[PDB]
Design a protein around this ligand. Structure first.
Ligand SMILES: O=C(c1ccco1)N1CCN(C(=O)C2CC2)CC1
Ligand SMILES: O=C(c1ccco1)N1CCN(C(=O)C2CC2)CC1
Length: 130
Protein backbone atom coordinates (compact mmCIF):
# COMPACT_ATOMS: atom_id res chain seq x y z
CA UNK A 1 0.00 0.00 0.00
CA UNK A 2 0.95 3.72 -0.30
CA UNK A 3 0.79 3.91 3.54
CA UNK A 4 3.41 1.07 3.79
CA UNK A 5 5.71 2.80 1.21
CA UNK A 6 5.40 6.01 3.36
CA UNK A 7 6.45 3.94 6.46
CA UNK A 8 9.64 2.67 4.70
CA UNK A 9 10.40 6.25 3.42
CA UNK A 10 10.25 7.55 7.05
CA UNK A 11 12.59 4.67 8.11
CA UNK A 12 15.13 5.71 5.39
CA UNK A 13 15.02 9.42 6.53
CA UNK A 14 15.65 8.30 10.18
CA UNK A 15 18.55 5.97 9.17
CA UNK A 16 20.28 8.67 7.00
CA UNK A 17 20.11 11.15 9.96
CA UNK A 18 21.63 8.62 12.47
CA UNK A 19 24.35 7.61 9.96
CA UNK A 20 25.31 11.28 9.23
CA UNK A 21 25.65 11.99 13.01
CA UNK A 22 28.04 8.98 13.35
CA UNK A 23 30.05 9.90 10.18
CA UNK A 24 30.82 13.52 11.32
CA UNK A 25 32.16 12.39 14.78
CA UNK A 26 36.04 12.71 14.69
CA UNK A 27 36.41 9.37 16.64
CA UNK A 28 34.72 7.45 13.76
CA UNK A 29 36.73 8.84 10.74
CA UNK A 30 38.44 5.39 10.32
CA UNK A 31 34.95 3.80 9.69
CA UNK A 32 33.74 6.38 7.04
CA UNK A 33 35.27 4.75 3.84
CA UNK A 34 36.25 1.17 2.84
CA UNK A 35 39.72 0.00 3.99
CA UNK A 36 42.03 0.84 1.00
CA UNK A 37 43.21 -2.45 -0.61
CA UNK A 38 46.46 -0.70 -1.78
CA UNK A 39 47.37 0.35 1.85
CA UNK A 40 46.18 -2.96 3.48
CA UNK A 41 46.40 -5.74 0.82
CA UNK A 42 45.89 -8.53 3.47
CA UNK A 43 42.56 -6.99 4.75
CA UNK A 44 40.17 -8.78 2.29
CA UNK A 45 41.89 -12.19 2.82
CA UNK A 46 40.94 -12.04 6.57
CA UNK A 47 37.68 -9.94 6.55
CA UNK A 48 35.14 -11.75 4.33
CA UNK A 49 32.35 -9.06 4.43
CA UNK A 50 33.88 -5.53 4.65
CA UNK A 51 31.50 -2.73 5.79
CA UNK A 52 31.80 1.06 6.38
CA UNK A 53 29.48 4.10 6.84
CA UNK A 54 29.68 5.25 3.12
CA UNK A 55 28.48 1.73 2.07
CA UNK A 56 25.67 1.92 4.71
CA UNK A 57 24.44 5.26 3.11
CA UNK A 58 24.48 3.57 -0.35
CA UNK A 59 22.48 0.56 1.05
CA UNK A 60 19.81 2.90 2.62
CA UNK A 61 19.24 4.52 -0.82
CA UNK A 62 19.10 1.02 -2.51
CA UNK A 63 16.19 0.10 -0.11
CA UNK A 64 18.31 -2.73 1.46
CA UNK A 65 17.00 -1.96 5.03
CA UNK A 66 13.28 -2.56 5.85
CA UNK A 67 13.80 -2.54 9.66
CA UNK A 68 16.19 -0.91 12.17
CA UNK A 69 17.25 -4.54 13.12
CA UNK A 70 18.51 -4.90 9.41
CA UNK A 71 20.51 -1.63 9.78
CA UNK A 72 22.04 -2.57 13.18
CA UNK A 73 23.33 -5.88 11.70
CA UNK A 74 25.62 -3.73 9.44
CA UNK A 75 26.70 -1.40 12.35
CA UNK A 76 27.52 -4.59 14.36
CA UNK A 77 29.54 -5.92 11.31
CA UNK A 78 31.66 -2.68 11.16
CA UNK A 79 32.47 -3.22 14.88
CA UNK A 80 33.08 -7.03 14.72
CA UNK A 81 35.37 -6.64 11.63
CA UNK A 82 37.51 -4.08 13.57
CA UNK A 83 37.76 -6.32 16.71
CA UNK A 84 38.73 -9.37 14.47
CA UNK A 85 41.36 -7.68 12.25
CA UNK A 86 42.98 -5.62 15.12
CA UNK A 87 43.11 -7.98 18.20
CA UNK A 88 46.60 -7.22 19.62
CA UNK A 89 47.71 -5.48 22.87
CA UNK A 90 49.62 -2.62 21.17
CA UNK A 91 48.23 0.93 21.31
CA UNK A 92 47.16 1.19 17.63
CA UNK A 93 44.96 -1.97 17.84
CA UNK A 94 43.57 -0.98 21.28
CA UNK A 95 42.60 2.54 19.99
CA UNK A 96 40.73 1.04 16.94
CA UNK A 97 38.85 -1.44 19.17
CA UNK A 98 37.84 1.30 21.69
CA UNK A 99 36.52 3.46 18.80
CA UNK A 100 34.65 0.44 17.23
CA UNK A 101 32.89 -0.30 20.57
CA UNK A 102 32.04 3.46 20.90
CA UNK A 103 30.51 3.48 17.33
CA UNK A 104 28.30 0.45 18.20
CA UNK A 105 27.29 1.81 21.64
CA UNK A 106 26.53 5.33 20.25
CA UNK A 107 24.31 3.91 17.42
CA UNK A 108 22.35 1.73 19.93
CA UNK A 109 21.95 4.71 22.38
CA UNK A 110 20.61 7.10 19.66
CA UNK A 111 18.14 4.38 18.51
CA UNK A 112 16.98 3.61 22.12
CA UNK A 113 16.22 7.37 22.68
CA UNK A 114 14.81 8.35 19.21
CA UNK A 115 13.18 5.24 17.56
CA UNK A 116 9.57 4.57 18.68
CA UNK A 117 9.18 0.79 19.47
CA UNK A 118 5.71 0.78 17.74
CA UNK A 119 7.28 2.27 14.54
CA UNK A 120 9.90 -0.57 14.51
CA UNK A 121 7.16 -3.21 15.18
CA UNK A 122 5.12 -1.87 12.17
CA UNK A 123 8.23 -2.12 9.89
CA UNK A 124 8.84 -5.75 11.10
CA UNK A 125 5.18 -6.77 10.45
CA UNK A 126 5.17 -5.24 6.89
CA UNK A 127 8.55 -7.08 6.15
CA UNK A 128 7.09 -10.41 7.48
CA UNK A 129 3.99 -10.02 5.15
CA UNK A 130 6.10 -9.75 1.91
O1 LIG B 1 46.86 -1.66 8.81
C1 LIG B 1 46.15 -0.60 8.73
C2 LIG B 1 46.65 0.54 8.01
C3 LIG B 1 46.10 1.55 7.31
C4 LIG B 1 47.20 2.29 6.75
C5 LIG B 1 48.34 1.66 7.16
O2 LIG B 1 48.03 0.58 7.95
N1 LIG B 1 44.87 -0.58 9.26
C6 LIG B 1 44.02 0.59 9.42
C7 LIG B 1 42.66 0.33 8.91
N2 LIG B 1 42.09 -0.92 9.49
C8 LIG B 1 40.84 -1.06 10.03
O3 LIG B 1 40.46 -2.14 10.47
C9 LIG B 1 40.00 0.11 10.11
C10 LIG B 1 39.07 0.07 11.33
C11 LIG B 1 38.50 0.05 10.03
C12 LIG B 1 42.98 -2.10 9.42
C13 LIG B 1 44.31 -1.74 9.99
O1 LIG C 1 14.44 -3.04 17.55
C1 LIG C 1 15.05 -2.22 18.19
C2 LIG C 1 14.38 -0.98 18.59
C3 LIG C 1 15.03 0.19 18.84
C4 LIG C 1 14.06 1.11 19.21
C5 LIG C 1 12.84 0.48 19.17
O2 LIG C 1 12.88 -0.85 18.80
N1 LIG C 1 16.45 -2.44 18.48
C6 LIG C 1 17.21 -1.82 19.59
C7 LIG C 1 17.41 -2.76 20.81
N2 LIG C 1 18.05 -4.02 20.44
C8 LIG C 1 19.12 -4.64 21.21
O3 LIG C 1 19.60 -5.73 20.81
C9 LIG C 1 19.66 -4.02 22.48
C10 LIG C 1 21.18 -3.81 22.66
C11 LIG C 1 20.51 -4.95 23.37
C12 LIG C 1 17.47 -4.69 19.19
C13 LIG C 1 17.12 -3.68 18.04
Amino acid sequence: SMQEEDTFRELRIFLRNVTHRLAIDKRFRVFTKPVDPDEVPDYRTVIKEPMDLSSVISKIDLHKYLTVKDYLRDIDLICSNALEYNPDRDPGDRLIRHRACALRDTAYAIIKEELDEDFEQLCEEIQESR
